[PDB]
């Protein structure tokens with residue numbers, strides 16, 4: 679699709695068997711989802727931006743379906759205000775910014 | 778241009794006759810720049826990010842060039858970690874997300 683930017687670019691995702699809404703965020707290095715269970719081992723991480731830092735769990739090799747496009751990568755889980763799809767998964771679905 | 782997302786989507790901007798680097802950010806409603814001087818009156822604004830909320834100064838109708846494209850619009854100034862070009866100005870330069 680071509681997504682204009684008049685409104686927040688929200689899409690439906692499927693992760694861990696759950697449907698969620700998430701923000702396509704070219705300003706995020708990483709993908710960050712609100713609290714949920716995921717399989718495998720994890721390690722703690724601190725991630726920052728406006729307002730400072732939050733602590734998250736880092737899970738590797740997680741499959742995600744983003745607006746119908748499957749991708750695999752690292753997913754961070756923690757107390758984010760909004761579910762965020764970052765560049766690590768945007769690249770995998772072929773997303774580009776065009777102007 | 779077409780900007781891929783394997784690296785951060787950093788571009789050169791010009792504001793107040795000075796060149797700066799900024800992040801093209803689909804996950805930002807607004808454009809937020811690190812401390813600098815801008816002309817005119819400002820109004821207060823609270824904005825939120827991953828870590829919480831910060832206060833910024835809102836300046837209206839500021840001339841800004843983004844990657845060679847001229848925009849005139851609202852610029853927020855405050856303690857952002859990184860200069861970000863948000864959707865208010867991405868729409869002025871005709872940017873879209875495509876996959």
Ligand SMILES: CCCC[C@@H](CN[C@@H](CCCC)C(=O)N[C@@H](CCC(N)=O)C(=O)N[C@@H](CCCNC(N)=[NH2+])C(N)=O)NC(=O)[C@@H](NC(=O)[C@@H](NC(C)=O)[C@@H](C)O)[C@@H](C)CC
Nearest residue numbers: 705706707708726727728804805806807824825826827858
């Ligand atoms: C400043 C740092 C770079 C840009 C920023 C954009 N993220 C978005 C989404 C964050 C969740 C809230 C953002 O802050 N957007 C703000 C920008 C400010 C603005 N006014 O536009 C926004 O739209 N805020 C809205 C509200 C958003 C939430 N709304 C809601 N919950 N209903 C607002 N009007 O205040 N990216 C990040 O915060 C990411 N940080 C990073 O990618 C890097 N960190 C640094 C410090 O560069 C990396 C080294 O970790 C996070 C997510 C970790 C991967």
